[PDB]
């Protein structure tokens, strides 16, 4: 029942190891979250092999505990309730007519810092597809993220679509299937069905020569009146 841990500005650290079709890479990220305002500011850096996939395809993988839950919805905030011990967040992300990512992450406090440690495995991608061919625009669409309880696992099931603009004007759909389960064995908040209204803006740091992504994201829970 850790929502009190989020009332201020919280430092965030992200660490990802990835392998997509045998192309290995790592990403570090830093920034801060202000859940009262649903606000995230993050900067990610590619640190090992040449990044084999477009940055926008990594946004969802690279801390939904920073969502703003309206007061009347606070009994539905699983993410903060699992803190500080944290939660495991797992996904399969199906890129339409292309490969899939499978991700496993642990999101938890290490002292004052909220840490997201991730392993990503991608298989079945096309060599010349939109992902491995780097054909996606550096931008990001707004949409809803749908949440339901998974009582049997004392957690939540989450599903949503992202629609990544392709450089030719078309769109590359990514269907996300997600599960979150507590790391600890104490009680958590199991929600009624609702969603997170999630908007994201991507940019570059003009002074950064490493391959990187700056992300500004605002997220608000919605769908339940009362």
d(CA 139, CA 57): 10
- Which pair of structure tokens corresponds to residue 177? 């299937």
Q: What is the DSSP letter of 70?
A: -
**How many Cβ atoms from other residues are within 10 Å of residue 87's Cβ?**
26
The residue written with tokens 């064995």 in the block is: 185
d(CA 38, CA 72): 15
d(CA 203, CA 32): 16
- Which pair of structure tokens corresponds to residue 81? 């309730």
3-state secondary structure of 116: strand
> In whole angstroms, how far apart are CA 18 and each of 58, 61, 110, 117?
10, 11, 22, 11
Dihedral angle of Cα 221, 37, 212, 204, to the nearest 10 degrees: 120
d(CA 19, CA 156): 26
In whole angstroms, what separates CA 71 from the centre of its chain?
23
* 181 within 8 A of 155, measured Cβ to Cβ: yes
Please provide the size of the chain in residues: 226
Note the resolution in Å, 1 decimal: 0.8
In whole angstroms, what separates CA 206 from the centre of its chain?
24
Could you give the angle at the alpha carbon of 152 between the alpha carbons of 191 and 92, nearest 5°?
80
d(CA 164, CA 219): 19
d(CA 172, CA 134): 12
* 83 within 8 A of 64, measured Cβ to Cβ: no
Q: How far from each other are the two terminal CA atoms of the chain, in whole angstroms?
A: 21
CB within 8 A of 160, min separation 6: which ones?
143, 144, 145, 146, 176, 178
DSSP H helices in the chain: 78-81
d(CA 58, CA 152): 29
Residue 168: half-sphere exposure toward Cβ, Cα within 13 Å: 8
Could you write out the DSSP letters of every residue in 134-160? T-B-S----EEEEEEEEGGGTEEEEEE
Is residue 157 packed enough to be buried (19+ CB in 10 Å), middle (13-18) or exposed (0-12)? middle
**How many Cβ atoms from other residues are within 10 Å of residue 220's Cβ?**
16
Q: 3-222 in CATH: which number?
A: 2.40.155.10
Closest CA to 50 of 20, 29, 79, 77: 20
């Amino acid at each position: 029942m850790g929502e009190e841990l989020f009332t201020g500005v919280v430092p965030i650290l992200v660490e990802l190891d990835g392998d997509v079709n045998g192309h290995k890479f790592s990403v570090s990220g830093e920034g801060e979250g202000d859940a009262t305002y649903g606000k995230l500011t993050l900067k990610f850096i590619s640190t090992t092999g040449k990044l084999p996939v477009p940055w926008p395809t990594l946004v969802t993988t690279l801390v939904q505990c920073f969502s703003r839950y309206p007061d009347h919805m606070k009994r539905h905030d699983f993410f903060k309730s699992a803190m500080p011990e944290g939660y495991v967040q797992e996904r399969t992300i199906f890129f339409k007519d292309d490969g899939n990512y499978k991700t496993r992450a642990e999101v938890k406090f290490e002292g004052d810092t909220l840490v997201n440690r991730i392993e990503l495995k991608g298989i079945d991608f096309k060599e010349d597809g939109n992902i491995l061919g780097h054909k996606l625009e550096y931008n990001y669409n707004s949409h809803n993220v749908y949440i339901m309880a998974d009582k049997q696992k004392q957690g939540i099931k989450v599903n949503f679509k992202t629609r990544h603009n392709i450089e030719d004007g078309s769109v590359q759909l990514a269907d996300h299937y997600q599960q979150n389960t507590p790391i600890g064995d104490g009680p958590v908040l199991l929600p009624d069905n609702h969603y997170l209204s999630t908007q994201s803006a991507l940019s570059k740091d003009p002074n950064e020569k490493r391959d990187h992504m700056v992300l500004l994201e605002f997220v608000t829970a919605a769908g339940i009146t009362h």
